């Protein structure tokens, strides 16, 4: 409870840790610690009744977040580990189930079968892109195919739990935590032309309530970098 | 010089042979190894994780997220089949496109057990009770609440726990995993009633496969 780090402090009270290994460190690279390790709290999304799902690309939503947006831009190469906190707060009269999963190398397919989706559609800068509950049309030029039952990658949506995941069951459970190591082939890769992770949240059992409660449930997501290292003389 | 003799089967090419081969590019000094996390060394490791079963197909909720959600509401009749599905191997059943099913469509012989982990996703104030009857193969499907209690079964409270795990063998009638209403759903006021149920499938890490083949889910 009341974990403190850097100059920002949040409060917790069961954590699933990646593929078993705790994130650790290794021209000459530098290891900055005093100006980066802080809990960057993203802005909160609203979970309506007929919602679909959201995603964030992980070394892209931290591109405007203060000092980290300089250390990504001044240092092209880099390698980091992450720590995610997702908690949605509601009463005892709400109901629903979330699936929080953190997929590595999440390639998405365009709507048109011959093109590829543009950059401003794959990753909103520190903002949640949203899934849809219908099909994305064919007549548009460059837009991401975001049918929720296939999760954008052309896979069965129920089979996504092979990745590091966690269930949020609003009847009993309340929060989820992930710890993700740096999973890439090349040890020091460019951070601008690469999105090595993707944090998805899909509602399986949709939100339901009675008349009189609040008609939305807010979800807050908090990311915290770890093992941040860059390249530069 | 040294006398030899060529046996038959000498200038032939077998598709599944293993002989030492000449390299095309020597002196390449190949890029070394790295401890990348998350290594798999046996394909049964994929089958141990849990995956959601699309048990609510009914030709209309197939292309949506209502395929995984079983509707449960407080009706007026006491005792009706909530859901039910057979366990026929491979013949278009509901366990076909899950993660356990997509590996076991590569082999022809397999024999072992299955964890069917359930989960009630409703409100935190609602109670109820459910029967989870498994019928052994050869015996008929139970058409009543009473004889389902006579078979092997497990009563599932909702207020105490929210997940009751059932173990069942599965071979290459064949069985039914039907589920019956024991009581209604007691709710307080200002709480909705139409709660849903998720279902998971797994491997009980105790079955082997033989005689590899290809899958039929391709052109």
């Amino acid at each position: 409870r009341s974990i403190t780090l850097g100059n920002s402090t949040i409060t917790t009270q069961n954590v699933v840790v990646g593929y078993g290994v705790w994130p650790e460190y290794l021209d000459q690279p530098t290891q900055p610690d005093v100006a980066t390790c802080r809990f960057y709290t993203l802005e909160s999304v609203q979970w309506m009744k007929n919602s679909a799902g959201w995603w964030w690309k992980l070394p892209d939503a931290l591109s405007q977040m203060g000092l980290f947006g300089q250390n990504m831009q001044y240092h092209y190469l880099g390698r980091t580990g992450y720590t995610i906190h997702v908690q949605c707060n509601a009463s005892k009269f709400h109901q629903g189930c979330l699936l929080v999963v953190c997929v590595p190398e999440a390639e998405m397919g365009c709507s048109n079968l011959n093109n590829t989706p543009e950059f401003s559609e794959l990753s909103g800068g520190d903002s949640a892109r949203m899934f849809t509950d219908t099909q994305v049309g064919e007549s548009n030029a460059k837009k991401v195919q975001t049918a929720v039952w296939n999760a954008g990658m052309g896979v069965g949506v129920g089979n996504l739990t092979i990745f590091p995941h966690q269930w949020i069951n609003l009847r009993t459970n309340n929060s989820a935590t992930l710890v993700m190591p740096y999973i890439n082939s090349v040890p020091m890769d460019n951070m601008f032309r690469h999105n090595n992770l993707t944090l998805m949240i899909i509602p399986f059992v949709p939100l339901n309530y009675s008349e009189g409660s609040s008609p939305y449930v807010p979800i807050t997501v908090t990311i915290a970098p770890m093992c941040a290292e860059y390249n530069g003389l | 010089g040294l006398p030899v003799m060529t046996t038959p089967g000498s200038t032939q090419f077998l598709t599944s042979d293993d002989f030492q081969s000449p390299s095309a590019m020597p002196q390449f000094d190949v890029t070394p190894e790295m401890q990348i996390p998350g290594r798999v060394n046996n394909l049964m490791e994929i089958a141990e994780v849990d995956s959601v079963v699309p048990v609510n197909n009914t030709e209309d909720n197939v292309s949506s997220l209502k395929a995984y959600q079983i509707p449960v509401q407080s009706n007026s009749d006491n005792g009706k089949q909530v859901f039910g599905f057979p366990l026929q191997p491979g013949a278009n059943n509901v366990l076909n496109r899950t993660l356990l099913g997509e590996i076991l469509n590569y082999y022809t012989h397999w024999s072992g057990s299955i964890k069917l982990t359930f989960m009630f996703c409703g409100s935190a104030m609602a109670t109820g009770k459910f029967l989870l009857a498994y019928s052994p193969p050869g015996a008929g499907v139970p058409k009543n609440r009473k004889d389902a209690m006579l078979g092997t079964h497990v009563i599932w409270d909702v207020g105490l726990q929210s997940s009751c795990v059932l173990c069942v063998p599965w071979i290459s009638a064949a069985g039914y995993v039907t589920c019956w209403y024991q009581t209604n759903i007691v709710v307080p006021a200002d709480v909705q009633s139409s709660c849903d149920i998720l279902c998971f499938v797994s491997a009980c890490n105790d079955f082997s496969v033989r005689m590899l083949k290809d899958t039929p889910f391709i052109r």
Epitope: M48, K49, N50, S51, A52, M130, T132, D133, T134, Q135, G137, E138, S139, P206 | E59, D60, N61, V62, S63, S64, K66, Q69
Partner: antibody, heavy 124, light 107 residues
Framework: EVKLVESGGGLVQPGGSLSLSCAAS????????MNWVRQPSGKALEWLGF??????????EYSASVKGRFTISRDNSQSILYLQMNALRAEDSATYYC????????????????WGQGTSVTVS | NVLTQSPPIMSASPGEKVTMTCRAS???????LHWYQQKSGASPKLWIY???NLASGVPARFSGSGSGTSYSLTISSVEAEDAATYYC?????????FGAGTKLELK
């Protein structure tokens, strides 16, 4: 009870523009999909394109033949709908309706249950 | 995808069993085909959705069936108020294409 009234029909020269307006009453506007179907006089129906609700991020999907020349946009303040027309031709002489779509079970079927009265747009 | 309704012109006396068909150029799903009814210069109204489920506020005589690429609709008895037009709608992909039309006049 739903009651969708639409206005803005009348004379327009070819090569110009036109802006229709379709008002909504009897429901919360940010929970139902809004469609637009034109019908030529005595001919088969053709669907133009729709607009999603607040929970889907307010996106649009037009048809293939009429993409670009039109634009579906909503107002955030009141339960009202706009339809921008640009560079009309002589063959868009039809009447324009206002349709609503809703969920039947828990999924999304593609039917349009409740329709407006229909305003008539002709060209010269 | 196009929809070949057949036939466009029918007339019927009160009391008979009348069928109309909707045949698709491809294999359209049973959950993506609906029926409408439009009176003489009036607003069109949904009649049957998803090929088996009646709408709200319709009599119980109308029922439809069919699967694959051909779908049909069956009325028990011809009455006095149901001489109008009919259309079937489909969705396998975009665009949403409509049918040719079934015009019905009383006898």
């Amino acid at each position: 009870e739903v009651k969708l009234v639409e206005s803005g029909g009348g004379l327009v020269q070819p090569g110009g523009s036109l802006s229709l307006s379709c008002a909504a009453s009897g429901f919360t506007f940010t929970d139902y999909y809004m469609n637009w179907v034109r019908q030529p006089s005595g001919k088969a129906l053709e669907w133009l394109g729709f607009l999603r609700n607040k929970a889907n991020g307010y996106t649009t999907e037009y048809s293939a033949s009429v993409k670009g020349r039109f634009t579906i946009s909503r107002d955030n303040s009141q339960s009202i709908l706009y339809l921008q027309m640009n560079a009309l031709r002589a063959e868009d002489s039809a009447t324009y309706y206002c349709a609503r779509s809703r969920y039947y079970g828990g999924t999304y079927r593609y039917a349009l249950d409740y329709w407006g009265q229909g305003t008539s747009v002709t060209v010269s | 995808n196009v929809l070949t309704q057949s036939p466009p012109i029918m007339s019927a006396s009160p009391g008979e069993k009348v069928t109309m068909t909707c045949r698709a150029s491809s294999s359209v799903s049973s959950s993506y085909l609906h029926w409408y009814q439009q009176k003489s210069g009036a607003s069109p109204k949904l009649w049957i959705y998803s090929t088996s489920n009646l709408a709200s506020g319709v009599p119980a005589r109308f029922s439809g069936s069919g699967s694959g690429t051909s779908y049909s609709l069956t009325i028990s008895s011809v009455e006095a108020e149901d001489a109008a037009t009919y259309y079937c709608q489909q969705f396998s992909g975009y665009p949403l294409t409509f049918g040719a039309g079934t015009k019905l006049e009383l006898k």
